[PDB]
Design a protein around this ligand. Structure first.
Ligand SMILES: NC(=O)c1ccc[n+]([C@@H]2O[C@H](COP(=O)([O-])OP(=O)(O)OC[C@H]3O[C@@H](n4cnc5c(N)ncnc54)[C@H](OP(=O)(O)O)[C@@H]3O)[C@@H](O)[C@H]2O)c1
Ligand SMILES: NC(=O)c1ccc[n+]([C@@H]2O[C@H](COP(=O)([O-])OP(=O)(O)OC[C@H]3O[C@@H](n4cnc5c(N)ncnc54)[C@H](OP(=O)(O)O)[C@@H]3O)[C@@H](O)[C@H]2O)c1
Ligand SMILES: CC1(C)[C@@H](OC(=O)CCC(=O)O)CC[C@]2(C)[C@H]3C(=O)C=C4[C@@H]5C[C@@](C)(C(=O)O)CC[C@]5(C)CC[C@@]4(C)[C@]3(C)CC[C@@H]12
Ligand SMILES: CC1(C)[C@@H](OC(=O)CCC(=O)O)CC[C@]2(C)[C@H]3C(=O)C=C4[C@@H]5C[C@@](C)(C(=O)O)CC[C@]5(C)CC[C@@]4(C)[C@]3(C)CC[C@@H]12
Ligand SMILES: [Cl-]
Ligand SMILES: [Cl-]
Lengths: 243, 251
């Protein structure tokens, strides 16, 4: 049974946190009394999230801006975050490269960049974070998609990258299990969440009610805190994916 | 399925210097296909080409190169096309060398696995699709039980094979609606008795490896019949559609 005090004084990194689900997550952590280090590319907007986080009562809150295309930024970012907080209890990998509904023809560039940002950078961040997570018996949260479990048209490169996440992280979870590494891995399968990005994307299709990003963010946090292997949001997916 | 379905058909096989790819090359040869085989080693490929001709291929050639080089990948399909006068089936089977190890910090390997086992396949598909569109042909993608189910020691490998499922399963859906008549077959294979695999599972407890010759054939049949997925061996579906869903729904 989750309680907010579980996050109190915890040292959390949230990526892709200038907007959408990431920013809701940071705000939730702040309200709970965690320390937070947020990142995205956009300085001014990260500062907005930081000051609001402080207002909500974050134990502490800092941003570091950069792109997750740059693997050197990824490594460095982690080193520098753990330093600001003096440690690391939870790594929330949430960011994603810009993607719209397109049929696949010849855009290998988009395919490689999707894999780099949505997947490769998650591996680099994990490798960098692992020493701190080991010492704190901490937690990794990887944010994926129903289209990382079931394939959909018009998002081939995206699905490839989200599938890759399932492939990699579930595998290292079995490895951490056999190697007695006390670091949890939570994979989040999300449906349609009402972020501006996702709603812009789906204006042209028939879909069910998008789920609120505030609640989505909360259920992610809860799942990671409780060290659940997989989180389904909205909850009615849980029945889909297992039937 | 009848062997006659492959006669005079123009087929590419990657990673055909040995293991399952070589057996597919030989089966297609016995059926009277045109084949173009590829891998890094010309001497091993020349031996495959020789035996294909003796088995009765309508024609057989190789082109040597590495699939780390996306330029080679793209130009390979073109040369293979012109050599056969066309393309009916593309069999994407190659894989970068991998051994069972705990992941620690080999980002080179994660990246190289992804370039060779997934991206090259996409480059190959892009290069081939125009010929495949003209012939209402077929793409066969060779994956793995570890491309559906979680195993330790194979993190980078699994990510790359999972990526294949995601990508090709997505474009299959696109092609159905756009009415692009190119079939996409994803093969999920268990342990197959190729030298690479047997060297890898050496001293591990396991069910008898399935024969590499029968594997190759079931792959060719699945693609020839335009099946969305092939499972080999036959025992594999009980794990995939029964055991795994239960383990999941229990946790
Ligand atoms: N919303 C949904 O319906 C939905 C569904 C399934 C899964 N998800 C997943 O949930 C997560 C967040 O989704 P969302 O809707 O919140 O997305 P979002 O609102 O578009 O936010 C994406 C975040 O990532 C950052 N970002 C983009 N490119 C970056 C780059 N190159 N380097 C570093 N940061 C970058 C963005 O900030 P900057 O632009 O300032 O860099 C932003 O903070 C993703 O993993 C997504 O796949 C969402
Ligand atoms: N055997 C199994 O139990 C098993 C199980 C599940 C899935 N599979 C899948 O089945 C497929 C074939 O497996 P296998 O056991 O037959 O493998 P294998 O005997 O080791 O053969 C691999 C082939 O790929 C080629 N290759 C390796 N690196 C290459 C590169 N950089 N560029 C171009 N070609 C390269 C090799 O030739 P060169 O070295 O001369 O380049 C060889 O022809 C793979 O997709 C594998 O994942 C196998
Ligand atoms: C099938 C439904 C409708 C949904 O279905 C349900 O929830 C119940 C069924 C229903 O509603 O009919 C489950 C999620 C989903 C499969 C959904 C998804 O997974 C991830 C994204 C991405 C979100 C985002 C922000 C990114 O992740 O970068 C931007 C790019 C991208 C690719 C845009 C499109 C959607 C929103 C995408 C594919 C649209 C279709 C959608
Ligand atoms: C669970 C069992 C025993 C098997 O059990 C049943 O058969 C039922 C199903 C397949 C499998 C999961 C199997 C697999 O799928 C793919 C490979 C790869 C084959 C190869 C050649 C490559 O693919 O490159 C070289 C690398 C690699 C990783 C070597 C190890 C195996 C053979 C691997 C993981 C060993 C364990 C194995
Ligand atoms: Cl938003
Ligand atoms: Cl062999």
């Amino acid at each position: 049974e989750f309680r907010p005090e579980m996050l109190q004084g915890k040292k959390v990194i949230v990526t892709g946190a200038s907007k959408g689900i990431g920013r809701e997550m940071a705000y939730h952590l702040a309200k709970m009394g965690a320390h937070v280090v947020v990142t995205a590319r956009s300085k001014e907007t990260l500062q907005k999230v930081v000051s609001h986080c402080l207002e909500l009562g974050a134990a502490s809150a800092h941003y570091i801006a950069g792109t997750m295309e740059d693997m050197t930024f990824a490594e460095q970012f982690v080193a520098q975050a753990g330093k600001l907080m003096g440690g690391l209890d939870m790594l929330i990998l949430n960011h994603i490269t810009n993607t719209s509904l397109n049929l696949f023809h010849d855009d290998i560039h988009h395919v490689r960049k999707s894999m780099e940002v949505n997947f490769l950078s998650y591996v680099v961040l994990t490798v960098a974070a692992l020493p701190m997570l080991k010492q704190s018996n901490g937690s990794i949260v990887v944010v994926s998609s129903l289209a990382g479990k079931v394939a959909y048209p018009m998002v081939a490169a995206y699905s490839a990258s989200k599938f890759a996440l399932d492939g990699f992280f579930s595998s290292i979870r079995k490895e951490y299990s056999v190697s007695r590494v006390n670091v949890s891995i939570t994979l989040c399968v999300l449906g349609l969440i009402d972020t501006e990005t996702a709603m812009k994307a789906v204006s042209g299709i028939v879909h069910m009610q998008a789920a609120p990003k505030e609640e989505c963010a909360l259920e992610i946090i809860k799942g990671g805190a409780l060290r659940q292997e997989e989180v389904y949001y909205d909850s009615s997916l849980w029945t889909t994916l297992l039937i």
